Backbone:
């Protein structure tokens, strides 16, 4: 019976995805078939409604020198972050000597636009290989985790930040109270801490269980974020839904009572209450839907094999580790996975050990089917792979249901 990392309440489990490997560890084929594994299960705190995993993976096992995800590998995301940076430069970063700190800046996808605007900034990026990619672009980066002590150190030497921003990173951090204390130490009194992460309501609506894996400790909602803010001295003052990464919300927190919440905050809270989003029964219904997607996906993949059809995967997502390991999908059913990330290529996916090959290798003669693990990138990918579909190749999707098109 684990304690909520937000409030210390009791977390009741509703979904057990079993034994899983580290999602972003890609092994060379000659490596020992030994892997770290942990139990992936999700529950909901009884007191603040925060949905969260019940076993933490230690941060240094996930985030370190060879972390492989490079944010800038998607054109949609590069545009998405450039626009956000422009929005901040026009609103929160006006005035003299503004300062923005990004938590989890990766390869500098967002902070490049800030640096090109001449605005003082600091990225925190504890994964040193992508940190170096950002530094190559002229971005100032500390290769450290953001937490209370490193935030204090930055406030000491650099002064208060007008904006603290985190995308697809807050939800990865079980030590969220320490981060919030770091934000309290570092943020200007009239500043904002803005984060965007996969949204519980989209996960439940689309049965997108592959959004649950080691790096995604929290599945935030407006309800839980509002409670988390309030308990830590802040206030949820804006929310915006975003289509990226399968559906997100961007949450804006301010010091309590410094700004009046937008109507959007109340409207999203009322819709979550109306739709019973975080009620344990709704969350168990989702868990039941997850098993149905497993069973239909494996039935399909086995029928394809019996029918002599070839099947590959597209995108060696961290997400797909949950899919292949919960569903038991290995190279006998999905022969290769195609991906543009050099440090994932010529390696095997975690747990299931499917070989990953460069996306340039996905070409005539094409396979019959491609299981689309990077389904959040469907539009971008399929635009680049029209020749596959024109040839008669078909995509297998498992969100929001198993279907082929
Ligand atoms: C856009 C695109 C991606 N890809 C590959 C790149 C990358 O390995 C994968 C896409 O991964 P993506 O869905 O962005 O992210 P992911 O599920 O691996 O998760 C990672 C780790 C992290 N914890 C997280 O939350 C998100 C931001 O990024 O697909 C590709 O081969 N062709 C393409 O056109
Ligand atoms: N405490 C912490 N502080 C800052 N970055 C962190 C962190 N824990 C993990 N990370 C970084 O968080 C990132 C998550 S991936 C998200 C990268 C990027 N913001 C994007 O949206 O695409 C990784 O690069 C990881 O190294
Ligand atoms: Zn709680």
Residues:
């Amino acid at each position: 019976p684990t304690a909520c990392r937000v409030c210390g309440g009791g977390v009741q489990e509703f979904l057990d995805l079993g034994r899983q490997p580290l999602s972003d560890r890609f092994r060379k084929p000659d490596e020992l078939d030994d892997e770290f594994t942990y139990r992936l299960a999700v529950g909901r705190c009884d007191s603040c409604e925060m949905v969260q995993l019940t076993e933490e993976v230690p941060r240094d096992l996930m985030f370190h020198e060879v972390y492989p995800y490079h944010s800038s590998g998607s054109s949609v995301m590069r545009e998405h972050f450039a626009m956000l940076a422009r929005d901040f430069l026009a609103t929160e970063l006006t005035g003299p000597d503004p300062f923005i700190v990004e938590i989890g800046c990766n390869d500098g996808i967002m902070l490049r636009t800030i640096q090109e605007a001449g605005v003082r900034h600091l990225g925190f990026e504890p994964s040193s290989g992508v940190a170096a990619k950002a530094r190559e672009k002229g971005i100032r980066v500390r290769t450290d985790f953001f937490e209370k002590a490193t935030a204090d150190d930055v406030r000491r030497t650099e002064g208060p930040a007008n904006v603290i921003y985190a995308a697809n990173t807050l939800c990865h951090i079980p030590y969220v109270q320490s981060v919030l204390e770091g934000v309290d130490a570092l943020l200007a009194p009239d500043g904002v801490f803005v984060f965007e992460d996969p949204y519980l309501g989209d996960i439940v609506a689309k049965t997108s269980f592959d959004q649950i894996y080691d790096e995604h400790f929290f599945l935030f909602s407006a309800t839980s974020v509002q409670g988390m803010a309030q308990r830590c001295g802040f206030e949820l003052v804006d929310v915006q839904r975003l289509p990226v990464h399968g559906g997100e919300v961007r949450y804006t927190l301010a010091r309590q009572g410094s700004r009046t919440p937008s109507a959007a905050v109340a409207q999203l809270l009322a819709a979550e209450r109306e739709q019973e989003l975080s009620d344990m029964a709704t969350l168990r219904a989702f868990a039941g839907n997850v098993v149905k997607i497993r069973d239909e996906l494996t039935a399909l993949l086995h029928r394809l094999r019996a029918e002599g059809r070839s099947v590959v995967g597209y995108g060696a997502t961290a997400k797909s580790a949950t899919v292949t390991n919960f569903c038991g999908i290995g190279p006998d059913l999905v022969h290769s996975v195609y991906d543009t990330t050099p440090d994932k290529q010529n390696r095997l996916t975690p747990g299931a050990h499917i070989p990953v090959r460069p996306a340039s290798a996905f070409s005539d003669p094409y396979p019959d089917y491609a299981l689309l693990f990077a389904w959040n990138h469907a539009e971008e990918i399929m635009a680049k792979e029209q020749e596959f579909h024109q040839a008669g190749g078909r995509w297998i999707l498992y969100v929001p249901e198993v279907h082929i098109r």
